[PDB]
Design a protein around this ligand. Sequence first.
Ligand SMILES: COC(=O)C[C@@](O)(CCC(C)(C)O)C(=O)O[C@@H]1C(OC)=C[C@]23CCCN2CCc2cc4c(cc2[C@H]13)OCO4
Ligand SMILES: [Mg+2]
Ligand SMILES: [Mg+2]
Ligand SMILES: [Mg+2]
Ligand SMILES: [Mg+2]
Ligand SMILES: [Mg+2]
Ligand SMILES: [Mg+2]
Ligand SMILES: [Mg+2]
Ligand SMILES: [Mg+2]
Ligand SMILES: [Mg+2]
Ligand SMILES: [Mg+2]
Ligand SMILES: [Mg+2]
Ligand SMILES: [Mg+2]
Ligand SMILES: [Mg+2]
Ligand SMILES: [Mg+2]
Ligand SMILES: [Mg+2]
Ligand SMILES: [Mg+2]
Ligand SMILES: [Mg+2]
Ligand SMILES: [Mg+2]
Ligand SMILES: [Mg+2]
Ligand SMILES: [Mg+2]
Ligand SMILES: [Mg+2]
Ligand SMILES: [Mg+2]
Ligand SMILES: [Mg+2]
Ligand SMILES: [Mg+2]
Ligand SMILES: [Mg+2]
Ligand SMILES: [Mg+2]
Ligand SMILES: [Mg+2]
Ligand SMILES: [Mg+2]
Ligand SMILES: [Mg+2]
Ligand SMILES: [Mg+2]
Ligand SMILES: [Mg+2]
Ligand SMILES: [Mg+2]
Ligand SMILES: [Mg+2]
Ligand SMILES: [Mg+2]
Ligand SMILES: [Mg+2]
Ligand SMILES: [Mg+2]
Ligand SMILES: [Mg+2]
Ligand SMILES: [Mg+2]
Ligand SMILES: [Mg+2]
Ligand SMILES: [Mg+2]
Ligand SMILES: [Mg+2]
Ligand SMILES: [Mg+2]
Ligand SMILES: [Mg+2]
Ligand SMILES: [Mg+2]
Ligand SMILES: [Mg+2]
Ligand SMILES: [Mg+2]
Ligand SMILES: [Mg+2]
Ligand SMILES: [Mg+2]
Ligand SMILES: [Mg+2]
Ligand SMILES: [Mg+2]
Ligand SMILES: [Mg+2]
Ligand SMILES: [Mg+2]
Ligand SMILES: [Mg+2]
Ligand SMILES: [Mg+2]
Ligand SMILES: [Zn+2]
Lengths: 49, 103, 50
Amino acid sequence: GVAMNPVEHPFGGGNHQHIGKPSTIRRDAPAGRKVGLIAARRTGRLRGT
Amino acid sequence: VNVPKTRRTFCKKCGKHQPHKVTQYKKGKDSLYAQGKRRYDRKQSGYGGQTKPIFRKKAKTTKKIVLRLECVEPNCRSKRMLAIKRCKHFELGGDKKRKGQVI
Amino acid sequence: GRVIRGQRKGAGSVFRAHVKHRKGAARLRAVDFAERHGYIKGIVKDIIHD
RNA sequence: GAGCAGAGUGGCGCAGGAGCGUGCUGGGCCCAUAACCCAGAGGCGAUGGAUCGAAACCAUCCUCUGCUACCA
RNA sequence: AGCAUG
RNA sequence: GAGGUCCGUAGCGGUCCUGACGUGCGAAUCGGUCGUCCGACCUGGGUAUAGGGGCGAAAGACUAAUCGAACCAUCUAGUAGCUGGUUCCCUCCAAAGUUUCCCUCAGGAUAGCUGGCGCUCUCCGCAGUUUUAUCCGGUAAAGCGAAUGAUUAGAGGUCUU
RNA sequence: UGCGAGUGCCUAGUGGGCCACUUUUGGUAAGCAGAACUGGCGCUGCGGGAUGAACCGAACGCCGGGUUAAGGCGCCCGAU
RNA sequence: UAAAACAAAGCAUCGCGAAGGCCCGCGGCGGGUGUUGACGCGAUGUGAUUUCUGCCCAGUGCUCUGAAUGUCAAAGUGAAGAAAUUCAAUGAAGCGCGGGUAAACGGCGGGAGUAACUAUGACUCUCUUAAGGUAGCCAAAUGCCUCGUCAUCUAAUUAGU
RNA sequence: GCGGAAUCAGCGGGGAAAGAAGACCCUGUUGAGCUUGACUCUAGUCUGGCACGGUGAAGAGACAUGAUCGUUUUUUCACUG
RNA sequence: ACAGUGCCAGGUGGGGAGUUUGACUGGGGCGGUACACCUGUCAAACGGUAACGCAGGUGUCCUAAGGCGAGCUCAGGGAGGACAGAAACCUCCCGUGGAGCAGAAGGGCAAAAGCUCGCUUGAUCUUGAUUUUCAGUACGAAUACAGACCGUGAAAGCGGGGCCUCACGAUCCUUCUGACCUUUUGGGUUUUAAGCAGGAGGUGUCAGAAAAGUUACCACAGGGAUAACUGGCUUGUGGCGGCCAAGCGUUCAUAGCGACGUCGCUUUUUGAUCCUUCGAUGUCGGCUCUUCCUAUCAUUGUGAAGCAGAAUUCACCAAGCG
Ligand SMILES: COC(=O)C[C@@](O)(CCC(C)(C)O)C(=O)O[C@@H]1C(OC)=C[C@]23CCCN2CCc2cc4c(cc2[C@H]13)OCO4
Ligand SMILES: [Mg+2]
Ligand SMILES: [Mg+2]
Ligand SMILES: [Mg+2]
Ligand SMILES: [Mg+2]
Ligand SMILES: [Mg+2]
Ligand SMILES: [Mg+2]
Ligand SMILES: [Mg+2]
Ligand SMILES: [Mg+2]
Ligand SMILES: [Mg+2]
Ligand SMILES: [Mg+2]
Ligand SMILES: [Mg+2]
Ligand SMILES: [Mg+2]
Ligand SMILES: [Mg+2]
Ligand SMILES: [Mg+2]
Ligand SMILES: [Mg+2]
Ligand SMILES: [Mg+2]
Ligand SMILES: [Mg+2]
Ligand SMILES: [Mg+2]
Ligand SMILES: [Mg+2]
Ligand SMILES: [Mg+2]
Ligand SMILES: [Mg+2]
Ligand SMILES: [Mg+2]
Ligand SMILES: [Mg+2]
Ligand SMILES: [Mg+2]
Ligand SMILES: [Mg+2]
Ligand SMILES: [Mg+2]
Ligand SMILES: [Mg+2]
Ligand SMILES: [Mg+2]
Ligand SMILES: [Mg+2]
Ligand SMILES: [Mg+2]
Ligand SMILES: [Mg+2]
Ligand SMILES: [Mg+2]
Ligand SMILES: [Mg+2]
Ligand SMILES: [Mg+2]
Ligand SMILES: [Mg+2]
Ligand SMILES: [Mg+2]
Ligand SMILES: [Mg+2]
Ligand SMILES: [Mg+2]
Ligand SMILES: [Mg+2]
Ligand SMILES: [Mg+2]
Ligand SMILES: [Mg+2]
Ligand SMILES: [Mg+2]
Ligand SMILES: [Mg+2]
Ligand SMILES: [Mg+2]
Ligand SMILES: [Mg+2]
Ligand SMILES: [Mg+2]
Ligand SMILES: [Mg+2]
Ligand SMILES: [Mg+2]
Ligand SMILES: [Mg+2]
Ligand SMILES: [Mg+2]
Ligand SMILES: [Mg+2]
Ligand SMILES: [Mg+2]
Ligand SMILES: [Mg+2]
Ligand SMILES: [Mg+2]
Ligand SMILES: [Zn+2]
């Protein structure tokens, strides 16, 4: 998504390839906005069970 | 500023100077059945979003202070609305400042 | 903006499953009197790749 | 150039009716030193004004540090 | 409980 | 005799010469030189996806020489404080770029400057002028042995420190 | 001293200005920027400044004669 | 503009046990994934292999629990009033309140003194933050000063190493 | 200062040469693409209320100084149409 | 008998829609407010008068710092008196204001407009007229009256805010106050609502829209009213050259130099301005090629040296050739 243009993905655009906004989003997001990690309870490298 | 709680001043109904209790006027609670309010409600009802302007660019920090004067005569009970110049601080019946004393 | 690809996948134009060479639905047999009370047997004829 | 912030015990800092921890001095403990204990001393960048009275408030100077200074 | 050095 | 293996035909593509041409053979072609060439390969036909939609190994790329929102008709003679144009003669009069207000500074409203039509009178009134009286002013000049603010140099006194 | 005055309607264009003698603010200065008074150019041709928007003279119906303004009178070129 | 861009295998997160996850649709017992079932479907980041992957949950996100003061709409309840009406109690989600999470977006200091010639300063004191840039790497396609300083390459090099 | 018909082959000084109502800059109370902590809305989605929408049995209640009987609010369990 | 559906209610909702994103300005941006006001000056002795001209101030404060009356005189200095002093308190003398009057500045003021006391609420109710900006419109502010009711003083008088010049705000909507007020519509009563008159809730872009960015993917109408490149005026800065003569040059101002001062030229630097050019005059360098200038490096001819020779400096005619 970061490799696209802002017209066609909420992640594209910018003079650097960066997301520019948190990837985690609420489950109650409209279609078009619901991209990335969906309603993540936890994120990062799992360390344990 | 400081204003005493009793003022001897003209009473329109009696036609002569009488004593008056002095208090501060506060704006009353808005009615739901004022003609303008119910016109506004009927215009808001529906689709179209907000219709009348909302004021945002406030500029004045101070409001004019308005004194409510109650005639003390037992059967007169007249009231007048009396405004004075605007000031940041206000009080009723403060202590009478006295000069020539240590501070 | 435009409709995004994950939003286009639900219209089923070019995102439908390629199912011409699939051999069928993999389903157990329908329940019946014999299966509910006793049993029946079958011979395993083929083992194929779909 | 224009904007902002900061000048105070030897050195780092707090803060309208001059202090903190460290440093220093003197005496304790110790064979002695550091550690520890008991005390003491040391001073609001400059100028003018408001206020009864200011390190603090308001202006002007002397230093210092940061943010800018685009577009052809 | 804490006890470094010559 | 394996390999998204190498050189290299056909095919597919399009590097460099920034070569040719550049009112061209051509609204993208030509030559030499190039990349790949058993694979994520090339290709006909059929078929599906249609405009704020499609499709995109992602360049805002392609969607009939049209794409950072196709094309056709209509609403529509859309709006323009902004450019350009605005058709015969003669006679008489003849300016303004200034005041106040406006999301006002390429624009208006308003006063001023103009013209036209008159009317009421005349054959006392007025004046971008002087004179005679009468007031008003604080600029040029001057002053600092006069106030305020500066500022140079010598004198004479004293116990005033 | 000079001169006929008063008064009412309707009204277009204009609301980018510029220059010069004296006064004058900013700026080193400017064919710079900003004001005061008067006159010009814009809206204006004509004689002179060789040439020129605003300089000097003078303002304009079509002509004949005469005379002047400012500026000129070696030749171009009218006039020592 | 053929590239350093995109893709890629690999790595790592996230949601979902079907009345479900993601998505389409004006609408229906509508439809795609789905002839599918976690070794799967869907959503993101990084980019083979080798070696590593430091600290921060203060901010902004996401997420788990609902009983303390809280707030909190419509409907319903009660009371007063002649009635419209007003008042009161009650009180969902969501915000606040309390945990977690950085292979989520992101972030990762300054000032003084000191070693027996100077120079550095391992060491000390101090103000401070959520944490104060760890392992590595460089005038790099990232360094203004800058044509940095040394060495090498040359007769001489703002170039290269 | 000077200048003499009509021409041919070259040439790139000049015509402030040609093409296109400057694409840079500014103005317009002209737009569009995109973004968000701009303003005003909105699809979707989460939650509450009323209707579809029934049958019982218990618990906690308001009722018609203890209990009973029959009116209703709610919690739980069970039933099916 | 809950999923679910129908209809309401609250939350979330750049997924999507519509729209806005001031002005002035030595181009625009950033900065600033010269956008509403006040004092001195500019400002040219009536009044008026500009620039992002100069020096400043304002969005307040005051139950008294408003109103009367009475009684006093201030800043400062001199001379004295236990502690006491540079500076506490007392006394006398001089003292035109050199003090104070809320604040910026200007004006004004001495048995007061200053200081201290006494009594008070003219900072109240009402209709007109006038001045200031001005269009002779509004607001704000102010001035003379007039009619009530009061304060104060023995009284004449003075007072409807602050000694004067600033300190503030329309339509619509809401809110309070006032009348034995009018309407609330076929008639009557009572709530309610609407009127009329006076205050308040505010628009600081202050005669008063409700409002964030980016475009190097861009478009349109125009603009030389307006920048970037060239040309024009100017020459601060840059470059070059003079005049004077403290000193240097072991002596010696001037062979060669030349401080402190001062006068110019040039348009090969940069600025300053915005006159031409936005229905287009092709932007830096390098290559190639021509010509011109002199402010002369070398070459020809000369003059001076702190010129013995050699080499080297200063200057003159001189751009022919490098
Ligand atoms: C086909 O059109 C052209 O030639 C191209 C063009 O638009 C390109 C614009 C730009 C230069 C900014 O790229 C242009 O050249 O601009 C203008 C031009 O047009 C012909 C002539 C002008 C006008 C007077 C002399 N000068 C010559 C060049 C020039 C150079 C500039 C500059 C402005 C100009 C202008 O500003 C920075 O340097
Ligand atoms: Mg891209
Ligand atoms: Mg988007
Ligand atoms: Mg960032
Ligand atoms: Mg509604
Ligand atoms: Mg191969
Ligand atoms: Mg090959
Ligand atoms: Mg190519
Ligand atoms: Mg070519
Ligand atoms: Mg050709
Ligand atoms: Mg569709
Ligand atoms: Mg492809
Ligand atoms: Mg469009
Ligand atoms: Mg206009
Ligand atoms: Mg307005
Ligand atoms: Mg025009
Ligand atoms: Mg004067
Ligand atoms: Mg004078
Ligand atoms: Mg001028
Ligand atoms: Mg004209
Ligand atoms: Mg005329
Ligand atoms: Mg004329
Ligand atoms: Mg001449
Ligand atoms: Mg004649
Ligand atoms: Mg002549
Ligand atoms: Mg990641
Ligand atoms: Mg990390
Ligand atoms: Mg957190
Ligand atoms: Mg390091
Ligand atoms: Mg080389
Ligand atoms: Mg290197
Ligand atoms: Mg040519
Ligand atoms: Mg144009
Ligand atoms: Mg155009
Ligand atoms: Mg405008
Ligand atoms: Mg728009
Ligand atoms: Mg918002
Ligand atoms: Mg949204
Ligand atoms: Mg939008
Ligand atoms: Mg503007
Ligand atoms: Mg005058
Ligand atoms: Mg008196
Ligand atoms: Mg009276
Ligand atoms: Mg007074
Ligand atoms: Mg209105
Ligand atoms: Mg770009
Ligand atoms: Mg792009
Ligand atoms: Mg111009
Ligand atoms: Mg130029
Ligand atoms: Mg010079
Ligand atoms: Mg000598
Ligand atoms: Mg001009
Ligand atoms: Mg040309
Ligand atoms: Mg051309
Ligand atoms: Mg010469
Ligand atoms: Zn009364």
